[PDB]
Design a protein around this ligand. Structure first.
Ligand SMILES: CC1=C\[C@@H](O)CC(=O)Cc2nc(co2)C(=O)N2CCC=C2C(=O)O[C@H](C(C)C)[C@H](C)/C=C/C(=O)NC\C=C\1
Ligand SMILES: [Cl-]
Ligand SMILES: [Cl-]
Ligand SMILES: [Cl-]
Ligand SMILES: [Cl-]
Ligand SMILES: [Mg+2]
Ligand SMILES: [Mg+2]
Ligand SMILES: [Mg+2]
Ligand SMILES: [Mg+2]
Ligand SMILES: [Mg+2]
Ligand SMILES: [Mg+2]
Ligand SMILES: [Mg+2]
Ligand SMILES: [Mg+2]
Ligand SMILES: [Mg+2]
Ligand SMILES: [Mg+2]
Ligand SMILES: [Mg+2]
Ligand SMILES: [Mg+2]
Ligand SMILES: [Mg+2]
Ligand SMILES: [Mg+2]
Ligand SMILES: [Mg+2]
Ligand SMILES: [Mg+2]
Ligand SMILES: [Mg+2]
Ligand SMILES: [Mg+2]
Ligand SMILES: [Mg+2]
Ligand SMILES: [Mg+2]
Ligand SMILES: [Mg+2]
Ligand SMILES: [Mg+2]
Ligand SMILES: [Mg+2]
Ligand SMILES: [Mg+2]
Ligand SMILES: [Mg+2]
Ligand SMILES: [Mg+2]
Ligand SMILES: [Mg+2]
Ligand SMILES: [Mg+2]
Ligand SMILES: [Mg+2]
Ligand SMILES: [Mg+2]
Ligand SMILES: [Mg+2]
Ligand SMILES: [Mg+2]
Ligand SMILES: [Mg+2]
Ligand SMILES: [Mg+2]
Ligand SMILES: [Mg+2]
Ligand SMILES: [Mg+2]
Ligand SMILES: [Mg+2]
Ligand SMILES: [Mg+2]
Ligand SMILES: [Mg+2]
Ligand SMILES: [Mg+2]
Ligand SMILES: [Mg+2]
Ligand SMILES: [Mg+2]
Ligand SMILES: [Mg+2]
Ligand SMILES: [Mg+2]
Ligand SMILES: [Mg+2]
Ligand SMILES: [Mg+2]
Ligand SMILES: [Mg+2]
Ligand SMILES: [Mg+2]
Ligand SMILES: [Mg+2]
Ligand SMILES: [Mg+2]
Ligand SMILES: [Mg+2]
Ligand SMILES: [Mg+2]
Ligand SMILES: [Mg+2]
Ligand SMILES: [Mg+2]
Ligand SMILES: [Mg+2]
Ligand SMILES: [Mg+2]
Ligand SMILES: [Mg+2]
Ligand SMILES: [Mg+2]
Ligand SMILES: [Mg+2]
Ligand SMILES: [Mg+2]
Ligand SMILES: [Mg+2]
Ligand SMILES: [Mg+2]
Ligand SMILES: [Mg+2]
Ligand SMILES: [Mg+2]
Ligand SMILES: [Mg+2]
Ligand SMILES: [Mg+2]
Ligand SMILES: [Mg+2]
Ligand SMILES: [Mg+2]
Ligand code: NA
Ligand code: NA
Ligand code: NA
Ligand code: NA
Ligand code: NA
Ligand code: NA
Ligand code: NA
Ligand code: NA
Ligand code: NA
Ligand code: NA
Ligand code: NA
Ligand code: NA
Ligand code: NA
Ligand code: NA
Ligand code: NA
Ligand code: NA
Ligand code: NA
Ligand code: NA
Ligand code: NA
Ligand code: NA
Ligand code: NA
Ligand code: NA
Ligand code: NA
Ligand code: NA
Ligand code: NA
Ligand code: NA
Lengths: 7, 237
RNA sequence: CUUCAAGGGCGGGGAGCCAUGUGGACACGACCCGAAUCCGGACGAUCUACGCAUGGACAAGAUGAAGCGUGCCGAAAGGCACGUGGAAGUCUGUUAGAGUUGGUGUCCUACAAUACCCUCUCGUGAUCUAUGUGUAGGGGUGAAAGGCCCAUCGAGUCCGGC
RNA sequence: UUGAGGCGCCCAAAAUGAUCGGGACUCAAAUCCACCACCGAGACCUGUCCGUACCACUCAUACUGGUAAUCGAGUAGAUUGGCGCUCUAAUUGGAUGGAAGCAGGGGCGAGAGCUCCUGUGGACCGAUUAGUGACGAAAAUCCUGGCCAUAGUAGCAGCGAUAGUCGGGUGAGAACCCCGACGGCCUAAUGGAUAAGGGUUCCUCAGCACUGCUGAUCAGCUGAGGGUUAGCCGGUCCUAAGUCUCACCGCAACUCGACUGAGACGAAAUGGGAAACAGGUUAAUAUUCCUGUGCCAUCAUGCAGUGAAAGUUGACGCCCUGGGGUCGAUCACGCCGGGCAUCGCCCGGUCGAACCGUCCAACUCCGUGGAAGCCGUAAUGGCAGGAAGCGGACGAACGGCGGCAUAGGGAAACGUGAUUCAACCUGGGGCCCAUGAAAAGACGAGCAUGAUGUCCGUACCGAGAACCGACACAGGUGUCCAUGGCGGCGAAAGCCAAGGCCUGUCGGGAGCAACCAACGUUAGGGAAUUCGGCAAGUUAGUCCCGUACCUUCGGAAGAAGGGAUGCCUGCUCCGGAACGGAGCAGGUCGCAGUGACUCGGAAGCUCGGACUGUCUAGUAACAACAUAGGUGACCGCAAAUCCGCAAGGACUCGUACGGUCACUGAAUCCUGCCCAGUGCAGGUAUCUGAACACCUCGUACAAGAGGACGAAGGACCUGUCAACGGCGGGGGUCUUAAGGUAGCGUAGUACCUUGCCGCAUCAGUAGCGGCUUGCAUGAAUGGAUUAACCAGAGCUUCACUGUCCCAACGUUGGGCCCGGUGAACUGUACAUUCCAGUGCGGAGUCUGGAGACACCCAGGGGGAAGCGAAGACCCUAUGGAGCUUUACUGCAGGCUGUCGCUGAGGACUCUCACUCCGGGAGGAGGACACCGAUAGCCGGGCAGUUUGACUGGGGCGGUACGCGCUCGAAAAGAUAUCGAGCGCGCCCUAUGGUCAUCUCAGCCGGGGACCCGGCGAAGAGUGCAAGAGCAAAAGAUGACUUGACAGUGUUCUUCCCAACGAGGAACGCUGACGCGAAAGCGUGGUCUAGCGAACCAAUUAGCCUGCUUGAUGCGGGCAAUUGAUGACAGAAAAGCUACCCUAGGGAUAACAGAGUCGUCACUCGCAAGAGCACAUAUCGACCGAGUGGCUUGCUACCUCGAUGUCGGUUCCCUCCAUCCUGCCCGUGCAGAAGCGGGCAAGGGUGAGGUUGUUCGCCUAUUAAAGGAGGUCGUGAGCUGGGUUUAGACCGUCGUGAGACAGGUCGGCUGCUAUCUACUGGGUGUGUAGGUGUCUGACAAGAACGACCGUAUAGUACGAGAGGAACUACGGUUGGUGGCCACUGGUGUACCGGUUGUUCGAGAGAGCACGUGCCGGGUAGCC
RNA sequence: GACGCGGUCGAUAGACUCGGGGUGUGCGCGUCGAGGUAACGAGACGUUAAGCCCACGAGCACUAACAGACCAA
């Protein structure tokens, strides 16, 4: 939910 | 949205309250059946945590020990008087009627016997101008001409500690220490720095108030912020 | 019935009522599960935010403010030198303690639902900290990030409306 | 010579392995013309059977007979007969001679399912009929339970705490239970004492089923017993912030609520406080028990005393500092004991309290004295208002001294002095816009003797196993020990005591491989790496010398740079002295003297924020927030601001030098113009402006209508921008008020853009400077500038280096093998795949081929659009929420009028209610204010909601959202698209109606007016699109007229077929009319567009009707007209979300795929043209034909219960449209150098500077430094610079939330491999006992590619300049395989030097991270 | 796991001794030593190509390759 999984 | 800071204030929580339990005295003029026979001797000059100005410890003939709003000049040993006949020197307190016009006065009463209300901050002083059998016009430190009952008691001289405002705080820490001894939440976050939800000036991708700052007097708490009922703004013109 | 009139509408030469099964409709949970809500009353400041009360903590070193002194110079004002002094939201500092920049390292079914190592910042102050205490849910608290209010926050949690 | 036809050829380039399905086929197994015979469905024919329908017979839907060429497939769905389950009832049966259930088996039925046999089981079970219903499962990421694979797999290694080993003891059993030795670990903790919290965990005995990361004889485990002793330690008492209770008051009410009053509560380490010490003792308590000694309080008695309450104490902040002084530590010497054994050193001990008595330094004061310059301090300071000196009063320690003590303790001695001095005591100084508790208690206030002194707590842990964190959790968790030794500035490192521990609790084995984690060292080069020097490294302590720009004069600054540094011998100086400090001379060792350890890399330019500080607990520490400073606003306190429903409250123990509300954000230089809009505020003739009362009308009253008066507010006017904001276009004013001043400028703001010039570099989208027309800078939305500061952004230099060229060796822990322990993720099934094809367009499973014996070990992760998470993007839903506003609607609140409280005599006096000030007397105020009620205005402060649909996704645009015409429309009717052309939302009293008279456009002739004649079926005209109609008229002219009439229908249309309203039309009737001789025409305009529901109002004529009844008023209704809903078959309605949320969708976008190929790339045909002449050496327009699938676009097939982005990197394969290399052809080919073309994919195609970039620009090298495919190959490989979350800034836009196909700083990369795949390693089976040697089907290779030089030759060729080749040689470069004599690296084998510390020194050793550091280095590996 | 070699008819491994190598001159003692009354004394020279050390080679049956089990047409 922050760009790449899971940043 | 959420209540703004001015609304949290009113609730009277710890954060917004003044450290009363650390305050020395509720400076108020003494009472006297009449006569004026009352007089005492200055015993000490103390620091008043509520006003950042000195207060004088006085001992009266009837063995009464109380702190007083120390005008400038009063020192230990000195003798002060309180009554319709007290002498007309600095430190003594007597009704405006018995006070000669053109004499700086401090801690003036608004209603005779209320113990003093006006002009009691560092260095300030009122100015008795006009006498009468009814009115005793006094010019308060704000410049206003206050018409008063000549029976209202007052102290001669200017309040001690004048000039306090001249030296800058220089650093946040100094402010911090002062603010800590008052009924005030500090530091102050600018409305325009908050989220819309928190203040009418909050929001935006940049910092600026939403609408004009001058707000109607009829505005409801929660919206009355910025320049309250300003008759004008700016310096120009 | 409408209608000068005319023409139209509705009705008319005796079949229904009740019961039982069953088809379908409408209201209700309405074939069953499935989600983000909204509202009510309660329980939470053992976490954390901010304030208050009462206690506690900060090796060592550096720099050397004012003030004071001695000497020289000057009519004086005052100047210069040296010393004394020991100021500071001052410096160095893994003192204690507080914090958390990079390694985008280790870990990532972990030692751990936020850890480990090195690196790094502050370290007499707007400092850090224990205990006590206050503020409660559209309300607090917020040096403001929509941050925080017990792993829960652009409106906590529990149960209820359901 | 020419025409035509057939088959073929050229044209003809693609990515893992070629293809007609494959093999393969050539007088065919191809092609075309005929022909012959066959094969081949469930079709067709045919036997039997079944169902269904119908016929005959029948009560029958039971039999029996008959008919079907004209019956037999089916999703959703309608209809119908039946099977099975539970329990009820009626009728009727079975079972211990064995019921139900279960397992295996036999029979029947199309089937649901029925039944039998054998075994098991051991007590219930059916049938028929009629009922009953929590009645039938393969599915729901369904629920619960159980279970397999996973797998004997991961974990029991990683942490600066690496810990053990040999003997022995006990035991059935011992790596880990115990004893000894040896070896280690912990030093503010891994020691000692405790708070909270736990709660018995403590001690003993007995145990091992549980728990313990292995085992266990051990245990915080299991069981049973036992254990906590107080006048003097805590609680208890006191009061703190503050809390509760009662009263009072509020509230509809309370378990609610503020104030006031009274009461109580509120501190166990760590606030205040009456009093206890020493030793001994238990398995476990201990200032508690025991022994000794001491002390406090109260009380009783006795003596004393009559004092006694004033005062002192309790009792207090931060910074500096002096003096007194104990323990500790150390020095000296003596004594006792131990250790060591070349020396004479080294370690330990040398004790002894509370209490009672006594001593008193500092401070203060007194007498004397009499300083005019002296006294005094570390410093400040002191004095004729009396200095020093002298005497004296008061007066301290947890300290000295005596006792306590022929007490206690010690094996013994059972010391004495000194220095530095924690504790403790007592002083001096400085700071505050900060002022640093209270109360109980104590003292004041004597002594003897005796008595009493109850109640509660007391164990143990206090943490890498007793607490919180689900765990014996690497996390979290307060206090006192800060004085143990060396070291050194040090509470630092390192080493070592005391004390603790070997439980940060699984072990054994392999020079121990690959690979990984931590780390050491690497020659030459030295940032070439990379977004970026990320990571690592360099530097380092102390002293001496020396130190730039700039600067707010503080700083910059440890700038920079240079030198020194050890040991030994003998000394000097400072000081009372130190086991303190500063130096001197001589001698002397090493590569190295802060020898280890500790321990800055430095310099410059630019951006930002002034600084310290704050922040997103858990991806953002920043430029964001704060700050001082600047500024504006409000308010005289019965205030402004704010909280409460109220009673009431914060600010406020406050008072303008205040405090509230905002903006800006240190200093310095400054801060221009604009009041039109919006906001706020002031004013206001006039206009507007609600309700009550008042007047008129109305009504026997009332509803209701109108008037008069008119508050705030608005209109209007003014003020105000450090108020929201604005600061252009045009010309030598215009919008809308002004029209950008100082500055600054390609900016964190500049699209163009890598702007131009310069600096710098070989090369610089960077950086800096200048210019600057600024897409779209600019003054407290603060502008410019700026010293200092910074885990902030960018750039340069020196230094440094494994970041790199380019990797190697080593060290430690894993990894691998063995014993023990022992999970999880995941699983529709099947599964040895590979190349192709096909398929819903991205297949292990389909089709064709190829390959393939089984099982197992290790590996790195290609594929399973791998695992994990019902996609966050996008759309959709008459979903949610947070937020905004001049969206809709309301609700608080503020202002204002009116009524009540409320009283006496459009302005005024008064006092008596009421309010406030005052202790009270009494003062102020006063019918106002407050309060209750109502009305008008303002009113995102708050609440609920809305904010449509269509659409080659959505948005923007548009409206194909209601209508009419032509075409599309395929000659009936119907017919779509954001299809083509274009219109309607009216207009007309005549432009309607009838009748009479008449014939038009245009052209010709005679006198673009008018008159006459002729031609003239229609091109005129007919209101308006388009199509259509019309000539004795539907047109023109004239006249007359109102049928544009009322009522009610029929039919068609709207809506083909085929239901649906309003609307429309055609055609009637009834009534009344107009015109005409009359037939007849007129239901508006020649026809098809010009339109609107219910509710409500107004209106038209008559009538019906309103609660027992009559009258009046005012209502309710039948029929109809008018008023709008254009989203036009009718809701009353704006936005943001990057803070987001849910339901879903591949119904729909973004990536990729797939189709297409306009675009893009490349080619071909024709060949104008030019190339001095010459198309074709070379270049090559137009036009035409294509190939590819790299670009772009289109489409919306695949995927939204997830196929991870760009770029880069690494590693592998491929294509050819060939850049180089080989062999060639042509030339505008003399040669040399080129140019164009052909074959050709074997090999090669490299290094760097700016930029995230791909692309591209640039540099120097080069044979050349080609292009493209592999999910734009490659994230279960890496990277994370850009895109693309949450924070922030700038510009632009917006009222605002907030937005941007603008820029900028910051910003977490998950998973143990089941299958398949390949690289290597084994075990088996097949060929059917063995050893040794071979063969070679096939397989792999680039095993080799390229360049330079010499001779040829200064030759051929050439006027000359210039300048080849065949061949033969030498070497270089890239690649490849191997090897270590040589050179080089490593080399925690080894040897040496040396620092600190410890073993007394010496000798010889340990530790300093897995070598302390330094020097050398064998083998091996490289 | 596999592979290779040796196994007394033996040099496969270890010990010992040589050889071949790495360091760089051992402890002790003697002389010198700036000095110092002496005590004491950093260090220098000699003894000492010393001492210490070796993952290689050789010699050498001293020690251990013993004992013996199994499968197999
Ligand atoms: C891994 C994944 C999906 C895949 O299983 C399927 C695909 O590959 C298809 C696909 N995905 C995409 C384009 O095609 C694509 O671009 N995705 C995947 C990578 C970022 C965005 C994306 O939306 O980023 C948007 C920005 C464009 C605003 C924001 C940040 C949203 C992120 C979001 O919800 N991520 C979920 C992940 C989905
Ligand atoms: Cl202030
Ligand atoms: Cl049936
Ligand atoms: Cl206690
Ligand atoms: Cl002093
Ligand atoms: Mg997100
Ligand atoms: Mg406060
Ligand atoms: Mg007061
Ligand atoms: Mg601020
Ligand atoms: Mg913000
Ligand atoms: Mg708001
Ligand atoms: Mg700003
Ligand atoms: Mg601003
Ligand atoms: Mg707490
Ligand atoms: Mg000094
Ligand atoms: Mg500091
Ligand atoms: Mg520091
Ligand atoms: Mg935000
Ligand atoms: Mg059928
Ligand atoms: Mg029966
Ligand atoms: Mg099913
Ligand atoms: Mg496995
Ligand atoms: Mg160890
Ligand atoms: Mg025990
Ligand atoms: Mg036991
Ligand atoms: Mg109490
Ligand atoms: Mg206490
Ligand atoms: Mg004990
Ligand atoms: Mg105890
Ligand atoms: Mg443990
Ligand atoms: Mg190197
Ligand atoms: Mg580079
Ligand atoms: Mg590079
Ligand atoms: Mg670094
Ligand atoms: Mg001396
Ligand atoms: Mg060093
Ligand atoms: Mg810049
Ligand atoms: Mg800052
Ligand atoms: Mg964070
Ligand atoms: Mg930071
Ligand atoms: Mg961070
Ligand atoms: Mg300010
Ligand atoms: Mg700021
Ligand atoms: Mg530039
Ligand atoms: Mg301005
Ligand atoms: Mg994948
Ligand atoms: Mg979904
Ligand atoms: Mg979105
Ligand atoms: Mg909503
Ligand atoms: Mg009052
Ligand atoms: Mg709202
Ligand atoms: Mg609702
Ligand atoms: Mg739509
Ligand atoms: Mg038709
Ligand atoms: Mg007509
Ligand atoms: Mg309506
Ligand atoms: Mg009307
Ligand atoms: Mg409609
Ligand atoms: Mg319609
Ligand atoms: Mg969702
Ligand atoms: Mg689709
Ligand atoms: Mg070719
Ligand atoms: Mg090839
Ligand atoms: Mg790719
Ligand atoms: Mg590629
Ligand atoms: Mg991959
Ligand atoms: Mg990944
Ligand atoms: Mg992985
Ligand atoms: Mg990034
Ligand atoms: Mg960047
Ligand atoms: Mg960025
Ligand atoms: Mg076989
Ligand atoms: Mg070591
Ligand atoms: Na804003
Ligand atoms: Na809701
Ligand atoms: Na709390
Ligand atoms: Na000085
Ligand atoms: Na850290
Ligand atoms: Na809430
Ligand atoms: Na509920
Ligand atoms: Na069917
Ligand atoms: Na163990
Ligand atoms: Na004493
Ligand atoms: Na600081
Ligand atoms: Na900081
Ligand atoms: Na204006
Ligand atoms: Na204005
Ligand atoms: Na501007
Ligand atoms: Na390295
Ligand atoms: Na794989
Ligand atoms: Na929300
Ligand atoms: Na709508
Ligand atoms: Na109709
Ligand atoms: Na093509
Ligand atoms: Na990539
Ligand atoms: Na090639
Ligand atoms: Na892909
Ligand atoms: Na990538
Ligand atoms: Na990744």
């Amino acid at each position: 939910x922050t760009x790449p999984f899971x940043x | 949205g959420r209540r703004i800071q001015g609304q949290r204030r009113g609730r009277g929580t710890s954060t917004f309250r003044a450290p009363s339990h650390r305050y020395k005295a509720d400076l108020e003029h003494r009472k006297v059946e009449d006569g004026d026979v009352i007089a005492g001797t200055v015993v000490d000059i103390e620091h008043d945590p509520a006003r950042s100005a000195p207060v004088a410890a006085v001992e009266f003939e009837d063995g009464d020990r109380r702190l007083i709003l120390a005008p400038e000049g009063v020192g230990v040993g000195d003798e002060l008087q309180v009554g319709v006949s007290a002498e007309i020197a600095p430190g003594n307190t007597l009704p405006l009627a018995e006070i000669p016009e053109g004499v700086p006065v401090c801690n003036v009463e608004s209603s005779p016997g209320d113990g003093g209300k006006f002009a009691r901050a560092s260095g300030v002083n009122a100015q008795l101008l006009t006498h009468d059998r009814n009115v005793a016009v006094v010019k308060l430190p704000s410049g206003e001409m206050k018409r008063l009952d000549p029976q209202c008691r007052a102290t001669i001289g200017v309040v001690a500690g004048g000039g306090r405002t001249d030296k800058p705080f220089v650093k946040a820490g100094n402010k911090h220490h002062k603010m800590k001894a008052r009924g005030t939440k500090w530091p102050n976050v600018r409305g325009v720095a908050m989220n819309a939800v928190d203040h009418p000036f909050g929001g935006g991708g940049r910092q600026h108030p939403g609408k004009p700052k001058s707000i109607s007097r009829n505005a409801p708490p929660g919206r009355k912020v910025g320049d309250i009922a300003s008759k004008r703004t700016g310096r120009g013109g």
